[PDB]
Amino acid sequence: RGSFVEMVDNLRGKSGQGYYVEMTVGSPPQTLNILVDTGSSNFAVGAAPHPFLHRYYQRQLSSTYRDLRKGVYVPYTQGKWEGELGTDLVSIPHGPNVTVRANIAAITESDKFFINGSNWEGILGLAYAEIARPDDSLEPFFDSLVKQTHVPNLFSLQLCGAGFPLNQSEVLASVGGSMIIGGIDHSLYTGSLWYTPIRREWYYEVIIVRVEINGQDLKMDCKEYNYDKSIVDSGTTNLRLPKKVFEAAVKSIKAASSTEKFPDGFWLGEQLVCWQAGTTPWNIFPVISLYLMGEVTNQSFRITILPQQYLRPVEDVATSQDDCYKFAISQSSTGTVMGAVIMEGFYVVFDRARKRIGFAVSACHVHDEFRTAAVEGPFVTLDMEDCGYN
C-alpha cells in the first residue's frame, strides 16, 4: 500500500511530444522541464539559446557547476546534438527529498532535436551506463541517485494518454502521469503486477515469446519478435516492430478491420484518419497481445492493448469536430520498441534491483464499455531463451 503523494501526478505531456518531469540544476536551483527517457542514458539539457527553448541551463550562474573539459556528440536517426560535459547538483521537486551531484551534458548545439512547443528543455536517460555517451564511464543520473542516497534502486512509470487531442493550454494544464522514484504506488494500477526479466542491463531489454492479433497467433519464429532486441522506451512515441513482424502484424490488423478501408498513408503512420464526433469504430480494430518471458521457468504472461492505445489521437487539419487518429505502430530496423503509446496502457515498474520489469493495467488507460487493456498469466511456454537474439 505504498503511497507517494509528492510524486503522483508529477508528469506532463503526451505520446506525440514526450512526457516530462520538472527538475532543478545548479545553485541557486535553475528549473527545467526534462523528458523522461528509458531508451537512453544521458542526462542532457539545453544550455544555450535556441528558438524552441523557453529557458536553458546557465552554467556561469551556478556556484556548484564543475567543468569536465570534455565534449560529447550524440546523433540520433532523426536529429542530433553536441554538448559539454560537467557535473552539478540536481533535484526533482516532485520526487524524493534529495539532491545529488550528477553528470550533465550541457547542450550547446543541436539540429532537429528540440521540438517547437514540446515544453521540455532536456532529457533524462534512465537506462544503463553501457549505452551512455561518450562511453560507459559517464555515470547515468539514476546510478548517481542510488549511489549517493538511500533511494531504493527502482522506479515506476504511469504515462496517461488523454484519448483525445490536447491543445497547448490543455497540455500545460493537464496531469500527464506519474514517475515514482524508488517505489511502486498501488493506486496507479489495477489487477496484478507481472514481471519479465531484464535480459541485459544496457537498454531495458526484454524478450517477447508470442504475438497475437485478436487471439490469433502471428506464428513467426519468436526470434523475429526480438530481432535484434526488444526494449521498453518511454522516449519513443510508437510501438516499433522489426520489418518482418511489422508487415505480418499490419497484414493481420488490416484483415481484422477490413469492413473499413484506409489509405496506405494511414498504415505508414503518416496520415490521420477522421471519424464523425463520437463514432470511432473501436470494435472493428483488433486487440494486440504481446507475451513476455516470465520469471518462472517455462512460464510467460501477456499484455493486451486496445486500438485506443495504438491509434494516437491527433487534432484535425480542418480543425473540425471529428475524432482523428494516426496509426501508432511502425517499422523498425533496430528491433522492437515498446514506446509511449504501449506504456500508456500499463503501469510499468522498472525494478533494477531485481533486474526485472513489471507490468500492470494502468488506472488511467483509455478504453470503452466493452474491452479493457489486460495483463494476464501464467501460460506454459517452452524454449523461451531461444527467442533472444545473439
Ligand X SMILES: NC1=N[C@@H]2CC[C@H](NC(=O)c3cccc(Cl)c3)C[C@@H]2CS1
Q: How far apart are CA 255 and CA 242, in angstroms?
A: 20
Residue 210 or 365 with smaller CB distance to ligand X: 365
Minimum gap (Å) between residue 385 Cβ and ligand X: 26
Residue 330 or 372 with smaller CB distance to ligand X: 330
User: How many C-beta atoms surround the C-beta of residue 55 within 10 A?
Assistant: 13
Q: Which DSSP helix (H) or strand (E) runs through 57?
A: none
Instruction: Work out whether 41 is an interface residue with ligand X (CB under 6 A).
Output: no
DSSP letters for 99-154: -EEEEEEEEEEEES-S-TT----EEEE-S-GGG-SS-TTS--HHHHHHHHS---S-
Stretch that binds ligand X, among 148-156, 231-239, 241-249, 273-281 (CB under 6 A): 231-239
Determine whether 37 is an active site residue. yes
Q: What size, in residues, is the chain? A: 390
Residues ≥6 apart with Cβ < 8 Å to 354: 195
Instruction: Work out whether 18 is an interface residue with ligand X (CB under 6 A).
Output: yes
Q: Residues binding ligand X: what is the number (CB under 6 A)?
A: 13
Q: Which DSSP helix (H) or strand (E) runs through 169?
A: helix 168-173
Single residue of 11, 90, 123, 213 touching ligand X by CB under 6 A: 123
Instruction: Work out whether 237 is an interface residue with ligand X (CB under 6 A).
Output: yes
Single residue of 24, 26, 39, 374 touching ligand X by CB under 6 A: 39
The maximal CA–CA distance of the chain, rounded, in angstroms, is 64
x/- map, 292-331, ligand X, by CB under 6 A: ----------------------------------------
Nearest position to ligand X, beta carbon? 39
Minimum gap (Å) between residue 206 Cβ and ligand X: 15
Q: How far apart are CA 56 and CA 43, in angstroms?
A: 14
3-class state of residue 286 by DSSP: coil
Stretch that binds ligand X, among 33-41, 49-57, 90-98, 296-304 (CB under 6 A): 33-41
Interface residue list for ligand X (CB under 6 A): 17-18, 37, 39-40, 76, 115, 123, 233, 235-237, 340
